[PDB]
Design a binder for this molecule. Structure first.
Ligand code: AGS
Ligand code: ADP
Lengths: 8, 340, 340
């Protein structure tokens, strides 16, 4: 549904 | 099919793109030239002729496709990839496009294989829980272009029978405004700038404008954007469209029956009042339109922004048989003169 | 079933100017598929795989060798690019996508995708920067992939299941261009020079071929470039393209059956008109190609731009049986001659 993709 | 006649009809509905019309007439004619009597040549692997349109916003891409469908005898489709979800998800699937093509051809396989395909907003599928409208759409479309027979249930399925309609014979027109495609081309063409006396120094913008920048594009430049090289390999043809011309803006408001001037004219004719637009006001509008960098679509802003006071005050006003718009009106310093 | 001599001729038909590269890929692919037919029924078990690593200039036909091979071999092929690749979990990409791409050719492969081939482009872009998600880190992830393993892959995207596919059997061909590698090997093997008086200057930029130096390339030189020796150990086979030649470009348009010159010739055969391409016109295309530093890839732009006027007017024109092209026409100062 919702993708929480984050990279430091 | 005549390249001289197809260009004459498109000239009626489209203006400002002379080079692009020549490209479409050649590619379109080469597409049908192969289907009717082609693939009977001494040399094998005749390259499939395709089209890849590229232009800014309001460049008339939709109009060119539409004008072709009306002129052309076979059917035409307008299938964007904004909602094309792969693997049969809730949004949509690529198979429906094949289905919609048959509806236009009335389940005629012999007539549907000779059809044309056009897609808008192809930049949105550029590769970046899961991704549904990303690079996945390229994979499904890739099979459609390279060539493959698919299975479509006739009438949706009452048996499990499908129609094995070919796809290598159908033409495809991938076109959409590519945002940011100018900085990438700028790096290659600029090749730095000299600092000494003899070396020439570039100004703010001499060759960095959208016009004369896409013609020198290459397939490797699109790879950095996000597209797949195999997808671009199947479309060796490219069509570069100029942003706009000052003279075309004056013609778009006078020759087309759907011009904005004629629209507002009928809006006031029902009220029992006449309207007029002098030539000095038309050319002034074109200078302000190009500054907005939006195209013909952003032309209504300049018109209604000027006729706001003219339309708001109008109903209360009486004995105003005709209204004249002077060049000063576009500037906004002087109000339009009223005729009693 | 095929042999190295038979495949050499087929490769020669579509590729030229690369003799050593043909023998390398021929014996490599020949012995690779021999291992699949025999499997491990012989005394020897777990027959090791031999990978291939190509190094050559840009537009030197590296991709064509892999594409033409897939047509004759008939096995599935994919063209992956390593520029987007990122180090295990970052915004750009993950290695998992590559595995599904190969299956995407047929979308259903259990004992059929193991025998497929894969190509990689721009391998030098991931060189270990020594000042990382772009550098060395990416190479570490590919080690286990090339060595052979199994990755879960949803077939067709969908079941509540995933299919396991081996990758030891799957051969990999890492293609790429290593610019500036001549300086590293020159000081090591031939001579330390280029800056001194007695030292040889780089006068032979185009007079002589850098290729000959690349033939003496070794894995130790690749370590200084940035690659990991462990990564190069998995790819013992080495292929070195020498250069592209002006006379070769003339042969590229005449010797290959799929030459662009022959496609237009076949296009007008059904039309009942003859086509011609003089030798004085092909040499000019070679100069324009080298001028844009693109090779054979930037060839259609020169041809299609020149024949746009002739092709557009050919259907309109009548009683024309032959077309002649001259060197002046390529420059754009002349119009091609027409014979009735
Ligand atoms: N070449 C053109 N000639 C005449 N009017 C045009 C032309 N291009 C655009 N217009 C006008 O602008 C309106 C919108 O044009 P569109 O072709 O829809 O713009 P567009 O750039 O194709 O939209 P996108 O970017 O594909 S969503 C048309 O209804 C016309 O009134
Ligand atoms: N011997 C050849 N005959 C015909 N075309 C060639 C030949 N060598 C290269 N090409 C052209 O080069 C293009 C492929 O270039 P490619 O090998 O992908 O460049 P790179 O080596 O940088 O990957 C193809 O479009 C093909 O037409």
């Amino acid at each position: 549904x919702x993708x929480x993709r984050x990279x430091x | 099919p005549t390249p001289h006649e197809i260009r004459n009809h498109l000239d009626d509905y489209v203006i400002g793109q002379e080079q692009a019309k020549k490209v479409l007439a050649v590619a379109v004619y080469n597409h049908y030239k192969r289907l009717r009597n082609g693939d009977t040549s001494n040399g094998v692997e005749l390259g499939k002729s395709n089209i890849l349109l590229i232009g800014p916003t309001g460049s008339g891409k939709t109009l060119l496709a539409e004008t072709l469908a009306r002129l052309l005898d076979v059917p035409f489709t307008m299938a964007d990839a904004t909602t094309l979800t792969e693997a049969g998800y809730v949004g949509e699937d690529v198979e429906n496009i094949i289905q919609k093509l048959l509806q236009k051809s009335d389940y005629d396989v012999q007539k549907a294989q000779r059809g044309i395909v056009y897609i808008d907003q192809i930049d949105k599928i550029s590769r970046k829980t899961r991704d549904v409208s990303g690079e996945g759409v390229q994979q499904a479309l890739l099979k459609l272009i390279e060539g493959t027979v698919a299975a479509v249930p006739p009438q949706g399925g009452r048996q499990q029978e499908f129609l094995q309609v070919d796809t290598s014979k159908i033409l495809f027109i991938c076109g959409g405004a590519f945002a940011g495609l100018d900085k990438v081309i700028s790096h290659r063409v600029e090749t730095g700038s000299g600092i000494g006396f003899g070396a020439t120094v570039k100004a703010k913008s001499d060759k960095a404008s959208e016009g004369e920048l896409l013609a020198q594009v290459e397939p490797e430049d699109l790879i950095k954007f996000g597209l797949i090289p195999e997808f671009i390999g199947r479309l060796p043809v490219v069509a570069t469209l100029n942003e706009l011309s000052e003279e075309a803006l004056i013609q778009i408001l006078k020759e087309p029956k759907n011009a904005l001037t004629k629209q507002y004219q009928a809006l006031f004719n029902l009220e029992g009042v006449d309207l007029e637009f002098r030539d000095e006001a038309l050319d002034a509008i074109a200078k302000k339109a190009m500054a907005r960098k939006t195209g013909a679509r952003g032309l209504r802003s300049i018109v209604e922004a000027a006729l706001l006071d003219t339309m708001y005050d109008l109903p209360s006003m009486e004995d105003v048989e005709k209204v004249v718009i002077d060049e000063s009106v576009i500037d906004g310093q002087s109000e339009p003169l009223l005729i009693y």
